[PDB]
Each structure stands twice: as structure tokens, then as C-alpha cells.
């Protein structure tokens, strides 16, 4: 009541809540430019 | 404006002695130097002059802790800023003037700040001004008509604070609100039928209180319970149909059914 | 052997290494061979820091295109010089003694004289 509440806080994940507040999976592909290439970087194509 | 003898303090002199490691301090930044490069990088920094900062327009971060400094009136001629940060809990007044010449900011952050007063009738002519961290703020005293036509703010909070009254005309246009946090009130006086033509908000904090719960006044509090009772859910786990409820008396709000 | 915190100027050394067009880099480096040059020809040459100068003497005549540079020291000990071009409008005031020895200048350009008042004696060794 007077003078008590949580110190902690939740997500308050709801059906009904804002739509842009759902976990979007964002995939942050880092690519390290590192000095490793590699030699197949495609397949050349097969053709027929 | 250049004037002189503004630096009683050589604490930028160390600072780039440390970054530039020019030769000497005497040694004045070039015309070169500032017209070739654009940006500087040094992250999480400790400057403690505060002068000089007007001239340099990168300014992104000021840990403002200074012991020897007594004026804040240092800040009156900026009039090219875009972007605003700072820091200080006992900040209680700034330079006047400034909002009518300048008409390009856009973000701005404040914590725990102490603006004892605004300028009444200024807000209307900006109506640009969209973003304004209303947390733990400590508007003791508001003048009539702050919220009335900005209707794109995101973030309301008058927790801990004195608001006995409400700005005039403000529930007419209140059709484009997200949030408004009406808890931890402490008015003395209200008028009749103000908090009912509140029907329009998501979500409302007024429960939970050893407060007075006198017919009318929870006559809105049930209306609005009924109206949205399954939308509401509490932060802190714990069963939702009991949680709000008539305080006082401690009967079940659903045998009550106001008289007259 | 490179040595870091030598250089102030990147500008006017990078000019002075490219300009000449020389062999090859495994070359040697000196001073007498290097500061051959007395007259710098390098537009909006800005070089400010002069102090410690006494080391090169053979430099008579800059040329400095450089408005921002009001700094005196530019004349406290420079009395070599056989001609002028300064573009500092604010010129309220004229260094005393360079008097002393200069014997050498031939050809003077002092436009925008603001001296309401001159000073006694001034030209009185200029025989």
C-alpha cells in the first residue's frame, strides 16, 4: 500500500499489448572482417 | 562574440596535452586543424572546464563535476544547438530568453531535475516540441494549459509531487493519448465531473490506497472497471479481479450500487 | 630510425618530400643540404610555430597567407627580412628596437597605416 511496492520490474508481455513491443528476432550478422578468406565463395553454377 | 579572459582554469590545457600532445599550451588551434577533420573520438570523458565548450559544436557528453565553479550563467549564448545531455540534481534555473530565437532543436533528456517555474503561454508558438521526460519531475506548481494541444507525448509520470489542479480546457482534444499515471496525488480541492470525462485513456492507477472512496467518486472508478476489466493487468504478480476494489469499508465493490 | 612526436607540420613536410621529386626514399637526410631553400614558395602556408628559430638563420623573406596569425613573436626577433605582407587589418601598434640592424630591406608595402600619430626618431638612422 502506502509507501510499498516492487524494487524489481517485469516485461508485461500481453496479447493485447502494443504490437511494437513483441521480441523481433534481429539478427545481428557481424561480419568480422577478419584476414581469413576463403576460397569458395560460390558454387561456380552447374548449368545443365 | 569573442571576449577575453573567460578561462581561469588550464584543465582543457591538460586535456589536450593528454589527446593532441601538442607542444605547448600557449600554441592556438589552427584553422587547419578544425577545417580538416570534423568529428573527435574519446569516449567516456572527464573534462572539468566548462568553458570553451561554446566554440567547439561537438559537444555529446558533460560529467558536470566541478567544485570550484559557482555560475551557470555560462549557457545563455547558445543559439545553434540541435542536441542536448546533462546531468545534475540540484539544477534549479536556467538563462531566459532562448526558446524564441531558436527553433531547431529536437531531443533533450532530463533526470531529477528541479524547474521550479515555466513560462506561461510560451508552449503554444512551439509546438514542435514533441519529447519531454516527465519523470520523477518536480513541477511543484503548473501553469494553465501545458498539456492541452501537445498531444504527442509518450511519457506522463507526476509521481511524488503536489498537483492540486488541472490545467483548463485539456479533456477536450485528450483523444490521441496513450498513457497518463494519475497515482501518488495529493490535491486538496477538484472540481465536479473533470475526472469523468476521462474515457478515452488505456490505463489508470488509482487503486490500491487507504484513500476515501465516497460515492461519486468511485462511481467512475467502477464505470471504468466494467468497461475495462479484462485489458488491466498488474505488474506485480498477484490475481486481478481483487485487485481493485473499493478501499474504506472493505465491502465487495459488486453489491454496491451507488443511490442518487 | 622513425621517431614518433617529431613533426608538428603533416601538410607542409608532406609538400617539401613531394614537390622535389627525389630518387628513391633510401636516401639520407640532413639539415645544411636540406635548408638550401630561403625563400618558401608554398601557398597558404600557414606555419605558425617559429619560436626556437635561431637554429635557421638563412631564412630571410616569408611569405604568409595566414590572416589568422596575429602572434608578435612573428616579429620579435625576426630583423632579417627584406620585405612585408601581412594582412592584419588590427594592426594598432608597431614592435620598437627591430631598428637596430635592419639595414638590408629594400622594398616596403605598408597599406591600411591607421597611425594617427608617429613615433620621434623613427626614420632617423634610415640613411
Known amino acids: 500500500g502506502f509507501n510499498c511496492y516492487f524494487p524489481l520490474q517485469s516485461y508485461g508481455f500481453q496479447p493485447t499489448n502494443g504490437v511494437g513491443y513483441q521480441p523481433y528476432r534481429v539478427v545481428v550478422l557481424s561480419f568480422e572482417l577478419l584476414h581469413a578468406p576463403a576460397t569458395v565463395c560460390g558454387p561456380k553454377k552447374s548449368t545443365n | 562574440t569573442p571576449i577575453k579572459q ?60 566541478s ?54 503561454g510560451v508552449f503554444d508558438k512551439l509546438t514542435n516540441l514533441t519529447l519531454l521526460h516527465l519523470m520523477v519531475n518536480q513541477l511543484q506548481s503548473l501553469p494553465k494549459g501545458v498539456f492541452d494541444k501537445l498531444t504527442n507525448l509518450t511519457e506522463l509520470d507526476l509521481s511524488y509531487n503536489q498537483l492540486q489542479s488541472l490545467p483548463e480546457g485539456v479533456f477536450d482534444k485528450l483523444t490521441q493519448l496513450k498513457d497518463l499515471r ?38 467512475y472508478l467502477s464505470e471504468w472497471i ?15 479481479p481483487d485487485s481493485a476494489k473499493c478501499s474504506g469499508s472493505g465491502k465487495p465493490v459488486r453489491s454496491i450500487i451507488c443511490p442518487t
Not at chain 2, 565553479?69 to 538563462?95: R, V
Open chain 2, 6 to 65: 573567460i578561462f581561469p582554469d588550464d584543465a582543457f590545457a591538460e586535456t589536450i596535452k593528454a589527446n593532441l600532445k601538442k607542444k605547448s599550451v600557449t600554441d592556438a588551434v589552427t584553422q587547419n586543424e578544425l577545417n580538416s577533420i570534423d568529428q573527435i573520438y574519446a569516449p567516456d570523458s572527464d573534462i572539468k572546464s566548462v568553458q570553451g565548450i561554446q566554440y567547439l559544436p561537438n559537444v555529446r557528453s558533460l560529467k558536470l563535476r
Open chain 2, 67 to 120: 567544485n570550484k565553479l559557482h555560475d551557470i550563467s555560462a549557457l545563455k549564448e547558445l543559439t545553434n544547438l540541435t542536441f542536448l545531455f546533462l546531468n545534475l540534481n540540484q539544477l534549479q534555473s536556467l538563462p531566459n530568453g532562448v526558446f524564441d530565437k531558436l527553433t531547431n532543436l529536437k531531443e533533450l533528456v532530463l533526470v531529477e531535475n528541479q524547474l521550479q517555474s515555466l513560462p506561461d
Open chain 2, 182 to 219: 494519475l497515482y501518488q496525488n495529493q490535491l486538496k480541492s477538484v472540481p465536479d465531473g473533470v475526472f469523468d470525462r476521462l474515457t478515452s485513456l488505456q490505463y489508470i492507477w488509482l487503486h490500491d490506497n487507504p484513500w476515501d472512496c465516497t460515492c461519486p467518486g468511485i462511481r
Open chain 2, 226 to 240: 466494467n468497461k475495462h476489466s479484462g485489458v488491466v493487468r498488474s505488474f506485480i504478480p498477484l490475481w486481478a
